[PDB]
């Protein structure tokens, strides 16, 4: 388990790879895979839909059960559910949907959830459907997370731009 390979080390605890998070999860067998969720755990597009499809929809049936028992999450919050065939656990984290004007400062609260886990495979929270700048999401990740985070960025052009922007920001 946790057989991460081919990552670029950005900090002593943050690693980044140009890869699809589902294919990584099947390669790596992580203890925790992170899902970029909404508060109802309705897995639409993005990482949530990719993860859910790879579980043959088991993720969504789990999520419906969870919500029926517990109610929706709060923005910036999380819950640990099963990782099904992809990981031991899936950490569902809700970033702010800036497209809806939710507080971007909740992106820090969202990444803080990662600090409850030794090692995790994760996407860049709020950087897709939720409209945050991916460079910002990387910045908050690096500044907030102290545990070992392996970031999967599937789009090569975004990956190249994120690395370039990280170098500029680190050197100042
Ligand atoms: N297969 C893949 N492997 C690796 N990276 C991937 C990927 N697919 C997409 N990305 C990238 C794009 C983007 O850079 C980041 C997060 O994008 P995102 O998944 O849209 O998450 P958000 O927090 O912005 O929106 C949350 C809302 O959409 C969700 O469906 C959920 O239901 C909620 O309603 O990961």
Curated annotation (Swiss-Prot):
Query: Consequence of mutating residue 31 to A?
Result: In strain: Mu/B.1.621
Residues in Macro domain copies? 1-170
Which reaction equations make up its catalytic activity?
Thiol-dependent hydrolysis of ester, thioester, amide, peptide and isopeptide bonds formed by the C-terminal Gly of ubiquitin (a 76-residue protein attached to proteins as an intracellular targeting signal)
What does the activity regulation annotation say?
A: Inhibited in vitro by GRL-0617.
Bilayer topology term: Multi-pass membrane protein
Q: Where found, per UniProt? A: Host endoplasmic reticulum membrane
This chain's function reads: Responsible for the cleavages located at the N-terminus of the replicase polyprotein. Participates together with nsp4 in the assembly of virally-induced cytoplasmic double-membrane vesicles necessary for viral replication. Antagonizes innate immune induction of type I interferon by blocking the phosphorylation, dimerization and subsequent nuclear translocation of host IRF3. Also prevents host NF-kappa-B signaling. In addition, PL-PRO possesses a deubiquitinating/deISGylating activity and processes both 'Lys-48'- and 'Lys-63'-linked polyubiquitin chains from cellular substrates.
Subunit (UniProt) = May form homohexamers. Interacts with N protein.
The identity of this protein, by name, is: Papain-like protease nsp3
């Amino acid at each position: 388990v946790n057989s991460f390979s081919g990552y670029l080390k950005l900090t002593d605890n943050v690693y980044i790879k140009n890869a699809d998070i589902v294919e990584e999860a099947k390669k790596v067998k992580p203890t925790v895979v992170v899902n970029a969720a909404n508060v109802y755990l309705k897995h639409g597009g993005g990482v949530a839909g990719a993860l859910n499809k790879a579980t043959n929809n088991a993720m969504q049936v789990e999520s419906d059960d969870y919500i029926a028992t517990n109610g929706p999450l709060k923005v910036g919050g999380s819950c640990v559910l099963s990782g099904h065939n992809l990981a031991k656990h899936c950490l569902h984290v809700v970033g702010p949907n800036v497209n809806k004007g939710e507080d971007i400062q909740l992106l820090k609260s969202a990444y803080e959830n990662f600090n409850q886990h030794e090692v995790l495979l994760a996407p860049l929270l709020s950087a897709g459907i939720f409209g945050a700048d991916p460079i910002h999401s990387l910045r908050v990740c690096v500044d907030t997370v102290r545990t070992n985070v392996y970031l999967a960025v599937f789009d090569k052009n975004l990956y190249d731009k994120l690395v370039s922007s990280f170098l500029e920001m680190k050197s100042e």
